[PDB]
Design a protein around this ligand. Structure first.
Ligand SMILES: [Zn+2]
Length: 46
């Protein structure tokens, strides 16, 4: 499963923003941090 991540329900265990499984919450909660930032897709070629 690489593409096509959607459905009906909530997954407070694994991050949905990107989709990455963690081992310990400690690291899980932290991950969100990076997400907090703008996290812009990216500029156009050039
Ligand atoms: Zn994420």
């Amino acid at each position: 499963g690489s593409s096509g991540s959607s459905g009906t329900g909530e997954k407070p265990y694994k991050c949905m923003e990107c989709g990455k499984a963690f081992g310990d919450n400690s690291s899980c909660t932290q991950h969100q941090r990076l997400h907090t930032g703008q996290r812009p897709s990216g500029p156009s070629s050039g």
